Amino acid sequence: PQVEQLARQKMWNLAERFVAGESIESAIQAVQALERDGIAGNLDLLGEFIDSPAKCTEFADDVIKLIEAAHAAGIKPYVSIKLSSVGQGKDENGEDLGLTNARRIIAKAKEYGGFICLDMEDHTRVDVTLEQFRTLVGEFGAEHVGTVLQSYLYRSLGDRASLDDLRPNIRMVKGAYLEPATVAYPDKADVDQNYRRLVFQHLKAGNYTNVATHDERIIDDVKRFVLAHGIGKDAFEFQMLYGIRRDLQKQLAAEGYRVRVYLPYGRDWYAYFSRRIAETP
Ligand SMILES: Cc1cc2nc3c(=O)[nH]c(=O)nc-3n(C[C@H](O)[C@H](O)[C@H](O)COP(=O)(O)OP(=O)(O)OC[C@H]3O[C@@H](n4cnc5c(N)ncnc54)[C@H](O)[C@@H]3O)c2cc1C
Ligand SMILES: O=C(O)[C@@H]1CCCO1
């Protein structure tokens, strides 16, 4: 309705803190702005839990269009995908559709020297995502595909250790989803301690670690750990969501740490944006 135009625009203005815009062009412009401030980008097309196999494959094709556009602009493709957006769990001609679309995405990013992260979704998808991650590392190399472990899950430390033979690039996060006490630590102090164990164990193992958090107490303790263990500032990076603690993003880059910002865009922004709102301090 014409009467609702102002409210629709106001909601989008709220979301624009967290979402670059709705187009590939808006996302590329936002990454160029980050790079001018010494910060790297990690592109994501928004959307998840896509029901139709056709739409899952269209979504993968749109991620490929993004990778082509980034490359043509002189940006090394670094893209995060949710496998539920590209068909994970659905069979097409005897193979998992998420796996076959992820192969196409990673092959394209790798042609251009790029990288794909498999985001971690809710706990029901962890086993299949870790199985598919191991398969994809075998096909494309640990330099070209990474994944995520969530510190709120009891299983995560064991999962991290199980992956060490792959020398994998892993992003450590607290965890974005609603999870019961049989699956996830209810006490935030345990989530935060387990976060440190994941980062510290990954660094000691010599694997590339993405320290994805806006929690300054944790960030300061990671700086301390890296100093005490003689770890180079080329061996890991901090990561933050677009729009959150921009001051820290800039400060860390000025101190010579690597910083890479998760940079989402697209028309289907409601789910991601709703999680940002629910997280408000
Ligand atoms: C780059 C990146 C990628 C991620 N990828 C995944 C993934 O694939 N799967 C997954 O389950 N989780 C993922 N996460 C984690 C999930 O998004 C977090 O649980 C959430 O970001 C919690 O924020 P936090 O670690 O800053 O800490 P918190 O303890 O939640 O917050 C720490 C402080 O950060 C600031 N802050 C954090 N969030 C907000 C906000 N929404 N609004 C305003 N201030 C805020 C506040 O100052 C807050 O007190 C990712 C997080 C990051 C940073
Ligand atoms: O989708 C989300 O809310 C989180 C943050 C980025 C990747 O997974």
From Swiss-Prot:
Its EC number is 1.5.5.2. Pfam families: Pro_dh. Its cofactor is FAD. The active site is at D119, R171. One of its GO terms (molecular function) is proline dehydrogenase activity. Substrate binds at K82, R275, R276. It catalyses: L-proline + a quinone = (S)-1-pyrroline-5-carboxylate + a quinol + H(+). It comes from the Bacteria. GO terms for biological process: proline catabolic process; proline catabolic process to glutamate. Pathway: Amino-acid degradation; L-proline degradation into L-glutamate; L-glutamate from L-proline: step 1/2. FAD binds at M120, Q150, R171, M172, V173, K174, G175, A176, T213, H214, R276, I277, A278, E279. Converts proline to delta-1-pyrroline-5-carboxylate. This is Proline dehydrogenase. It comes from Deinococcus radiodurans (strain ATCC 13939 / DSM 20539 / JCM 16871 / CCUG 27074 / LMG 4051 / NBRC 15346 / NCIMB 9279 / VKM B-1422 / R1).
